[PDB]
Design an enzyme around this catalytic site. Structure first.
Site, PDB file in Angstrom:
ATOM      1  N   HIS A   1     -49.796 -16.269  17.503  1.00 27.44           N
ATOM      2  CA  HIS A   1     -50.840 -16.581  18.509  1.00 27.44           C
ATOM      3  C   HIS A   1     -52.304 -16.442  18.000  1.00 27.44           C
ATOM      4  O   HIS A   1     -53.120 -15.750  18.609  1.00 27.44           O
ATOM      5  CB  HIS A   1     -50.635 -15.753  19.789  1.00 27.44           C
ATOM      6  CG  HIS A   1     -49.479 -16.212  20.605  1.00 27.44           C
ATOM      7  ND1 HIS A   1     -49.391 -17.512  21.071  1.00 27.44           N
ATOM      8  CD2 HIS A   1     -48.362 -15.575  21.024  1.00 27.44           C
ATOM      9  CE1 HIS A   1     -48.271 -17.644  21.748  1.00 27.44           C
ATOM     10  NE2 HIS A   1     -47.630 -16.492  21.732  1.00 27.44           N
TER      11      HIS A   1
ATOM     12  N   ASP B   1     -52.700 -20.670  20.237  1.00 20.30           N
ATOM     13  CA  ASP B   1     -53.048 -20.179  21.579  1.00 20.30           C
ATOM     14  C   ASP B   1     -53.333 -18.690  21.695  1.00 20.30           C
ATOM     15  O   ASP B   1     -52.872 -17.895  20.901  1.00 20.30           O
ATOM     16  CB  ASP B   1     -52.068 -20.592  22.677  1.00 20.30           C
ATOM     17  CG  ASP B   1     -52.063 -22.104  22.946  1.00 20.30           C
ATOM     18  OD1 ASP B   1     -53.104 -22.810  22.753  1.00 20.30           O
ATOM     19  OD2 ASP B   1     -50.971 -22.584  23.356  1.00 20.30           O
ATOM     20  N   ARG B   2     -54.123 -18.346  22.719  1.00 21.24           N
ATOM     21  CA  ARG B   2     -54.555 -16.990  23.076  1.00 21.24           C
ATOM     22  C   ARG B   2     -55.501 -16.325  22.064  1.00 21.24           C
ATOM     23  O   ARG B   2     -56.532 -15.814  22.461  1.00 21.24           O
ATOM     24  CB  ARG B   2     -53.381 -16.078  23.405  1.00 21.24           C
ATOM     25  CG  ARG B   2     -52.426 -16.642  24.469  1.00 21.24           C
ATOM     26  CD  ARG B   2     -51.658 -15.544  25.205  1.00 21.24           C
ATOM     27  NE  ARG B   2     -50.774 -16.067  26.228  1.00 21.24           N
ATOM     28  CZ  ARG B   2     -49.571 -16.589  26.009  1.00 21.24           C
ATOM     29  NH1 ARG B   2     -49.078 -16.692  24.781  1.00 21.24           N
ATOM     30  NH2 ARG B   2     -48.849 -17.008  27.045  1.00 21.24           N
TER      31      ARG B   2
ATOM     32  N   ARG C   1     -40.788 -16.903  34.408  1.00 22.42           N
ATOM     33  CA  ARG C   1     -41.760 -17.849  33.897  1.00 22.42           C
ATOM     34  C   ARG C   1     -41.823 -19.119  34.710  1.00 22.42           C
ATOM     35  O   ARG C   1     -42.781 -19.855  34.582  1.00 22.42           O
ATOM     36  CB  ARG C   1     -41.456 -18.235  32.438  1.00 22.42           C
ATOM     37  CG  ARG C   1     -41.523 -17.068  31.423  1.00 22.42           C
ATOM     38  CD  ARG C   1     -40.873 -17.544  30.130  1.00 22.42           C
ATOM     39  NE  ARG C   1     -40.682 -16.508  29.122  1.00 22.42           N
ATOM     40  CZ  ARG C   1     -41.584 -16.136  28.222  1.00 22.42           C
ATOM     41  NH1 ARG C   1     -42.822 -16.676  28.200  1.00 22.42           N
ATOM     42  NH2 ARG C   1     -41.241 -15.207  27.324  1.00 22.42           N
TER      43      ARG C   1
ATOM     44  N   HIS D   1     -36.994 -19.710  18.670  1.00 25.39           N
ATOM     45  CA  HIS D   1     -38.112 -19.028  19.327  1.00 25.39           C
ATOM     46  C   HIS D   1     -37.701 -18.262  20.597  1.00 25.39           C
ATOM     47  O   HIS D   1     -37.957 -17.061  20.741  1.00 25.39           O
ATOM     48  CB  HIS D   1     -39.247 -20.010  19.654  1.00 25.39           C
ATOM     49  CG  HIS D   1     -40.429 -19.344  20.267  1.00 25.39           C
ATOM     50  ND1 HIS D   1     -41.206 -18.453  19.557  1.00 25.39           N
ATOM     51  CD2 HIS D   1     -40.924 -19.354  21.534  1.00 25.39           C
ATOM     52  CE1 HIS D   1     -42.150 -17.961  20.353  1.00 25.39           C
ATOM     53  NE2 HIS D   1     -42.016 -18.507  21.558  1.00 25.39           N
TER      54      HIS D   1
ATOM     55  N   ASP E   1     -44.038 -14.075  16.817  1.00 19.41           N
ATOM     56  CA  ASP E   1     -45.241 -14.789  17.310  1.00 19.41           C
ATOM     57  C   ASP E   1     -46.509 -14.308  16.590  1.00 19.41           C
ATOM     58  O   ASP E   1     -46.622 -13.119  16.292  1.00 19.41           O
ATOM     59  CB  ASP E   1     -45.486 -14.494  18.780  1.00 19.41           C
ATOM     60  CG  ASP E   1     -44.437 -15.008  19.664  1.00 19.41           C
ATOM     61  OD1 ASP E   1     -43.248 -15.049  19.281  1.00 19.41           O
ATOM     62  OD2 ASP E   1     -44.834 -15.315  20.797  1.00 19.41           O
TER      63      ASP E   1
ATOM     64  N   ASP F   1     -44.965 -20.185  17.872  1.00 19.57           N
ATOM     65  CA  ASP F   1     -46.089 -19.637  18.626  1.00 19.57           C
ATOM     66  C   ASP F   1     -47.181 -19.169  17.678  1.00 19.57           C
ATOM     67  O   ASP F   1     -47.536 -17.980  17.630  1.00 19.57           O
ATOM     68  CB  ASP F   1     -45.609 -18.556  19.605  1.00 19.57           C
ATOM     69  CG  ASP F   1     -45.121 -19.135  20.896  1.00 19.57           C
ATOM     70  OD1 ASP F   1     -44.865 -20.349  20.977  1.00 19.57           O
ATOM     71  OD2 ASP F   1     -44.925 -18.369  21.828  1.00 19.57           O
TER      72      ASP F   1
ATOM     73  N   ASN G   1     -42.615 -22.546  22.025  1.00 20.09           N
ATOM     74  CA  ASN G   1     -43.065 -23.264  23.208  1.00 20.09           C
ATOM     75  C   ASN G   1     -44.546 -23.593  23.224  1.00 20.09           C
ATOM     76  O   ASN G   1     -44.966 -24.475  23.982  1.00 20.09           O
ATOM     77  CB  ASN G   1     -42.682 -22.549  24.515  1.00 20.09           C
ATOM     78  CG  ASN G   1     -43.195 -21.131  24.631  1.00 20.09           C
ATOM     79  OD1 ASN G   1     -42.988 -20.291  23.755  1.00 20.09           O
ATOM     80  ND2 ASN G   1     -43.779 -20.825  25.789  1.00 20.09           N
ATOM     81  N   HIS G   2     -45.360 -22.862  22.436  1.00 17.24           N
ATOM     82  CA  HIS G   2     -46.786 -23.179  22.335  1.00 17.24           C
ATOM     83  C   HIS G   2     -47.134 -24.315  21.343  1.00 17.24           C
ATOM     84  O   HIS G   2     -48.292 -24.778  21.281  1.00 17.24           O
ATOM     85  CB  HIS G   2     -47.620 -21.916  22.065  1.00 17.24           C
ATOM     86  CG  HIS G   2     -47.827 -21.086  23.287  1.00 17.24           C
ATOM     87  ND1 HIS G   2     -49.034 -21.036  23.972  1.00 17.24           N
ATOM     88  CD2 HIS G   2     -46.966 -20.299  23.977  1.00 17.24           C
ATOM     89  CE1 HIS G   2     -48.901 -20.223  25.011  1.00 17.24           C
ATOM     90  NE2 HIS G   2     -47.653 -19.769  25.041  1.00 17.24           N
TER      91      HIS G   2
ATOM     92  N   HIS H   1     -40.820 -14.608  21.149  1.00 20.29           N
ATOM     93  CA  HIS H   1     -41.138 -15.132  22.514  1.00 20.29           C
ATOM     94  C   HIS H   1     -41.543 -14.068  23.561  1.00 20.29           C
ATOM     95  O   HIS H   1     -42.138 -14.391  24.592  1.00 20.29           O
ATOM     96  CB  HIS H   1     -40.000 -16.076  22.952  1.00 20.29           C
ATOM     97  CG  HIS H   1     -40.215 -16.845  24.215  1.00 20.29           C
ATOM     98  ND1 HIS H   1     -41.254 -17.738  24.397  1.00 20.29           N
ATOM     99  CD2 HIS H   1     -39.423 -16.971  25.311  1.00 20.29           C
ATOM    100  CE1 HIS H   1     -41.118 -18.343  25.577  1.00 20.29           C
ATOM    101  NE2 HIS H   1     -40.017 -17.886  26.153  1.00 20.29           N
TER     102      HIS H   1
HETATM  103 FE   LIG Z   1     -45.664 -16.333  22.527  1.00 19.42          FE
HETATM  104 FE   LIG Z   2     -43.192 -18.151  23.387  1.00 22.02          FE
END
Ligand SMILES: [Fe+3]
Ligand SMILES: [Fe+3]
Length: 286
Positions: free
Chosen positions: A54, A83-84, A209, A161, A52, A80, A112-113, A236
């Site tokens: 991010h 995001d963040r 989750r 992922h 990841d 990923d 997933n992002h 992940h």
């Molecule tokens: Fe992530």
């Molecule tokens: Fe993830």
């Protein structure tokens, strides 16, 4: 103006603001490539594999410093990208730039992002709205919807992922996933992007989750034996050392964003696979 885009991306929290048309061009051209290549990638070593990012653009540049800027090394990223972090745009744009420039030696999987309904919440929509517009974010979404889902390196390392699925009986089921598509709330595509290994679960479990499942070490062992594989490489989850083994080294979690989201004190890691399928790790301390 691909070389010019890469140049400005590489010249540098300091932002790089490309033009809308340039970014839109990156999405449209990369999208074509993704759809022209399989949804289950069949890759060969030597390869570097990253987890990841991010939006931690400065760490993405670090990864390429350690691993070699393309085309010096070949790359598989596990998802990923956005995001963040504070620089998703820069992150994803350089990734898409390299995919267009080196399309047989640079590979990106879907995390997933890379899903509009997650982006909406976790920062990417906001970054796109502020720096450009909502129409650009929708262009990124259509590009994301075409990303491949998994990769097999030299018929022995299965990469995705998230992880496994109770619905995954045959590799053909992955190949029959149709793109473009959004990621559903349940089923095979969901699980590949959302599942987690767990030391304390036997078989398939509830995932904290609220999406997908957890799976234990025997699920991994079985999967590997059945499909004649040696390793599951996934991402992940943040892990203290940047990589972490599970099920007696039958699965590895990779995470490539050091000092994740300012909250954790973790290293990032990158995995090298050589032509003999030997795996080593390069470590990026925070
Ligand atoms: Fe992530
Ligand atoms: Fe993830």
């Amino acid at each position: 103006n691909l070389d010019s885009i890469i140049g400005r991306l590489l010249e540098v929290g300091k932002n790089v603001q490309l033009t809308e048309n340039e970014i839109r061009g990156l999405c449209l051209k990369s999208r074509e490539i993704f759809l022209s290549q399989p949804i289950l990638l069949e890759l060969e070593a030597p390869l570097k594999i990253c987890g990841d990012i991010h939006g931690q653009y400065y760490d993405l540049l670090r990864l390429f410093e350690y691993g070699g800027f393309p085309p010096e090394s070949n790359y598989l990223f596990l998802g990923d990208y956005v995001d963040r972090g504070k620089q998703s745009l820069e992150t994803i744009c350089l990734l898409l730039a390299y995919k267009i420039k080196y399309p047989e030696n640079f590979f990106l999987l879907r995390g997933n992002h890379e899903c509009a309904s997650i982006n909406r919440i976790y920062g990417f929509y906001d970054e796109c709205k502020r720096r450009y517009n909502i129409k650009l974010w929708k262009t990124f979404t259509d590009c994301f919807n075409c990303l491949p889902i998994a990769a097999i390196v030299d018929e022995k390392i299965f990469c995705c992922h998230g992880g496994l699925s109770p619905d995954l009986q045959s590799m053909e089921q992955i190949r029959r996933i149709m793109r473009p598509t959004d990621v559903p709330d349940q089923g095979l595509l969901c699980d590949l992007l959302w599942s987690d290994p767990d030391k304390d679960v036997q078989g398939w479990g509830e995932n904290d989750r609220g999406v997908s499942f957890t799976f234990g070490a025997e699920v991994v062992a079985k999967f590997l034996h059945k499909h004649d594989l040696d390793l599951i490489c996934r991402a992940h989850q943040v892990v203290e050392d940047g990589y972490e083994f599970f099920a007696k080294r039958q699965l590895v979690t990779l995470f490539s964003a050091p000092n994740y989201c300012g909250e954790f004190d973790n290293a990032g890691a990158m995995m090298s696979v050589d032509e003999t399928l030997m795996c080593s790790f390069q470590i990026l301390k925070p």
